[PDB]
Design a protein around this ligand. Structure first.
Ligand SMILES: Nc1nc2c(ncn2[C@@H]2O[C@H](COP(=O)(O)OP(=O)(O)CP(=O)(O)O)[C@@H](O)[C@H]2O)c(=O)[nH]1
Ligand SMILES: [Mn+2]
Ligand SMILES: [Mn+2]
Length: 603
C-alpha cells in the first residue's frame, strides 16, 4: 500500500494520529514518494546535495557549508491579501469595522475555504516527494512547547525547518500520542509541469493561499515556497494560531524579540520588543552595545511566547530554533553579531553572489577585492549602474540560533526568562521622541494599540501584529488589559521608541544601532526606580540620557513634542481604533484615547 512509496522511515514508527494525517493527505495530494524526516545531519547533506543537483541551491564556496537559493521573483514575500483565517463566525477572526474593509486580518468562510481547498490540493504533489517534518516550537520538552507535523513537497522547506525549529525523529519520540498542529503545504506545481519554471523554483502565485483553521488546529498553505508562507511553524503557527491558543489559555504569543541586558555591576534584565518589518528587531536583539561594561545577549529575534509564572513574573520563551533575518543592511558595522552568526551552516535566499562564491547585498559595506564581480539575485552580471539592487530587498538568511556568539545562556531554558520591560516602536520620521514610557498598564496597552510606522506611507501596525492576529483584535486588546487583574502580577514597564526621527533634511537625529544601548540603560534604570512628565508619557529628564562618547545630538528636536503634531496624532489614532475595532474596542482603551486628548489639550 502506502508503504510501497515510503523512501525513508517507516509508517509503523509513526504515532497513529501522525500516520492518519499522512495517510489522508498522501491520498489527496498523490505524491510519488514519502520521506519521513529524521532531522539527522546525514539527511540534511543528502537533501542539500539533491537540491544542488536540481538547481534549487548553489554552494557558496567562500564559507563553511552555506548555500544560496534564488526564487521566482513572483514568490518573494508574504501576501497578506492571500492569507486568511477560517472560523464559523467572522467576528471571531476580525472585528466588523465601521467603514471600509478590516485591516486587522482577513476572514474566509468555512464554505468558501472548502471550495478553495478542493480547487488546489487534489493531485498537487504528483511527480513529487512528500516530506514529513515532525517539529517542536520551543525546547524539545518545555511546558511551553508545542509540536506540529508539516507535510510539504519542498526540500527547501525541509532544510529551512531543520534550522528554524527543532526537527526530526526526537520530536516524534517526544510527541508520542500527544496532539499536534496539522500543517499541510504544497508549492502547487504537480508534474508534469504545466507552466514555466523560473530558477528551478516552483510556485503558483495565482492560486497562492495561506489558510489557518484554529478549531481544527490545521494550517494549510498552497502556492508559495517563500519562508513566511511555507515555514508553517513560524508566522502561521507560532504567531497566528498560537495567539488564539494563548488567549484561550492565559498566555501570549507576540511578534517580539527577547534580549537580556547586563549592566556594569552584573545586574541582568530581560526585555521584549515588538517592532514591525524593516524596523530593527534583529539589530536590537543581537546588539553589540557601545556603552562600556554593558552586555546584551539574544534570546530570540522574532517571536516570543509569554506566560505568568507562579510568582507573577511574565516569563518568555523563544519558540524558534534559528534566525530568518533580512540580509540587506546587515554589516560588520550595523550588526557584527549577525555577520558572525551567518559564517557557516546558513541558507541564503535571493541575495547576490560574488565570483569567489561569497554573498553580497545592499548595505553589506564590504569592498570587493580586485577582479571580484557580482551576480545579482536574478542571475545576471550586476553593477551599481544598473538601477536595481543586487539582492531582493526582503532577501534573507536562515541560520542556527546556537551560532549567535551572544546567544543567551537561558535561550532554551524550559522555564523561560522573566520579562521586566516591553518595548514598542516603529519608523516615524517626525513628531515622535526617541523614547518615552507609558503612564500605566492600560496606557501601555493603548501605546501598543496605537503603533504606526512608515513603510511614502505611514500605516497602523498595532503591537507589530497587524498581519498576524489569530483572532479578533478587540478581544486581543481585552486579553492584554486583563493582565492587570492577574493576581500578584509583576507587570513589565512599557516603553515606546523611535530610532528613526529625522531633521528637515531627512537625516537621522539619532545614530542608532549599538548606540541604542543608551536608551536601554535609561529603561533599565527606570525599571529599578529619572522622569520628565509629558502628555504622551515620561521622557528622560534633562541630561539623564548618557551621551558620553557621542558626537553632537540635537536632543531638543529629538525629544520635541508638538501640540499640533499630537493633536493630529491622537485624531488619527482615535479614528483608526474606533473605526476598525468598533464594537469590540474595550472601554479601557476608549478612556485612554480620551485621556490623551485631554492631556494634549492642556498644552
Ligand atoms: N537608522 C537606523 N536603522 C536601523 C536601526 N536598526 C536597524 N536599522 C535598519 O533597519 C533595517 C531592518 O533591520 P532588521 O534588524 O532586519 O529588522 P527586523 O525587525 O528584524 C525585520 P523582520 O521581522 O522581517 O526580520 C536594516 O536595514 C537596519 O540597518 C537603527 O537603530 N537605526
Ligand atoms: Mn529580523
Ligand atoms: Mn518578523
Amino acid at each position: 500500500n502506502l508503504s510501497a512509496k515510503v523512501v525513508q522511515g517507516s509508517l509503523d514508527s509513526l504515532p497513529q494520529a501522525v500516520r492518519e494525517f499522512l495517510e489522508n493527505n498522501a491520498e489527496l495530494c498523490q505524491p510519488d514518494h514519502i520521506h519521513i524526516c529524521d532531522g539527522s545531519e546525514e539527511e540534511n547533506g543528502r537533501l542539500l546535495g539533491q537540491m544542488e543537483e536540481e538547481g534549487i541551491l548553489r554552494r557558496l564556496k567562500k564559507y563553511d557549508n552555506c548555500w544560496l537559493a534564488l526564487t521566482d521573483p513572483r514568490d518573494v514575500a508574504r501576501i497578506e491579501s492571500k492569507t486568511v483565517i477560517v472560523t464559523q463566525e467572522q467576528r471571531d477572526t476580525v472585528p466588523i469595522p465601521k467603514t471600509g474593509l478590516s485591516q486587522l486580518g482577513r476572514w474566509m468562510s468555512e464554505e468558501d475555504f472548502e471550495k478553495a481547498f478542493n480547487a488546489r490540493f487534489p493531485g498537487c504533489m504528483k511527480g513529487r516527494t512528500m516530506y514529513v517534518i515532525p517539529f517542536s516550537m520551543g525546547p524539545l520538552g518545555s511546558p511551553l512547547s508545542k509540536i506540529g507535523i508539516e507535510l510539504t513537497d519542498s526540500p527547501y522547506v525541509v532544510a529551512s525547518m531543520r534550522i528554524m525549529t527543532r526537527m526530526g525523529t526526537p520530536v516524534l519520540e517526544a510527541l508520542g500520542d500527544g496532539e499536534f498542529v496539522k500543517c499541510l503545504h504544497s508549492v502547487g506545481c504537480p508534474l508534469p509541469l504545466q507552466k514555466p519554471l523560473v530558477n528551478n523554483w516552483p510556485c503558483n502565485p495565482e492560486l497562492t493561499l495561506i489558510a489557518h483553521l484554529p478549531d481544527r488546529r490545521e494550517i494549510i498553505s498552497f502556492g508559495s515556497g517563500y519562508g513566511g508562507n511555507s515555514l508553517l511553524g513560524k508566522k502561521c503557527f507560532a504567531l497566528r494560531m498560537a495567539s488564539r491558543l494563548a488567549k484561550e489559555e492565559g498566555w501570549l504569543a507576540e511578534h517580539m524579540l527577547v534580549l537580556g541586558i547586563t549592566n556594569p555591576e552584573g545586574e541582568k534584565k530581560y526585555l521584549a520588543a515588538a517592532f514591525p518589518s524593516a524596523c530593527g528587531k534583529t539589530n536590537l536583539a543581537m546588539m553589540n552595545p557601545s556603552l562600556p561594561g554593558w552586555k546584551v545577549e539574544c534570546v530570540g529575534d522574532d517571536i516570543a511566547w509569554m506566560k505568568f509564572d507562579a510568582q507573577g513574573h511574565l516569563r518568555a520563551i523563544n519558540p524558534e530554533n534559528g534566525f530568518f533575518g533580512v540580509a540587506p543592511g546587515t554589516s560588520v558595522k550595523t550588526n557584527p553579531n549577525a555577520i558572525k552568526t551567518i559564517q557557516k551552516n546558513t541558507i541564503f535566499t535571493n541575495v547576490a553572489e560574488t565570483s569567489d562564491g561569497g554573498v553580497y547585498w545592499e548595505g553589506i559595506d564590504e569592498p570587493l577585492a580586485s577582479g571580484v564581480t557580482i551576480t545579482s539575485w536574478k542571475n545576471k552580471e550586476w553593477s551599481s549602474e544598473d538601477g536595481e539592487p543586487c539582492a531582493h530587498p526582503n532577501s534573507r538568511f536562515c541560520t542556527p540560533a546556537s551560532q549567535c556568539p551572544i546567544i543567551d545562556a537561558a535561550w532554551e531554558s524550559p522555564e523561560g526568562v522573566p520579562i521586566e520591560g516591553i518595548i514598542f516602536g516603529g519608523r516615524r520620521p517626525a513628531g515622535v521622541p526617541l523614547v518615552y514610557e507609558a503612564l500605566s498598564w492600560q496606557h501601555g496597552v493603548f501605546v501598543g494599540a496605537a503603533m504606526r510606522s512608515e513603510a511614502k506611507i505611514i500605516m497602523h501596525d498595532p503591537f507589530a501584529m497587524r498581519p498576524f492576529f489569530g483572532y479578533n483584535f478587540g478581544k486581543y486588546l481585552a486579553h492584554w488589559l486583563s493582565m492587570a487583574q492577574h493576581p500578584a502580577a509583576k507587570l513589565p514597564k512599557i516603553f515606546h521608541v523611535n530610532w528613526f526621527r529625522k531633521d528637515k533634511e531627512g537625516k537621522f537625529l539619532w545614530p542608532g544601532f549599538g548606540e541604542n544601548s543608551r536608551v536601554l540603560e535609561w529603561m533599565f534604570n527606570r525599571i529599578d526606580g529619572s522622569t520628565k512628565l509629558t502628555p504622551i508619557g515620561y521622557i528622560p529628564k534633562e541630561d539623564a540620557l548618557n551621551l558620553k562618547g557621542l558626537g553632537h545630538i540635537n536632543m531638543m528636536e529629538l525629544f520635541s513634542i508638538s501640540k499640533e503634531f499630537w493633536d493630529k496624532e491622537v485624531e488619527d489614532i482615535e479614528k483608526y481604533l474606533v473605526d476598525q475595532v468598533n464594537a469590540d474596542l474595550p472601554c479601557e482603551i476608549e478612556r485612554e484615547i480620551l485621556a490623551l486628548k485631554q492631556r494634549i489639550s492642556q498644552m
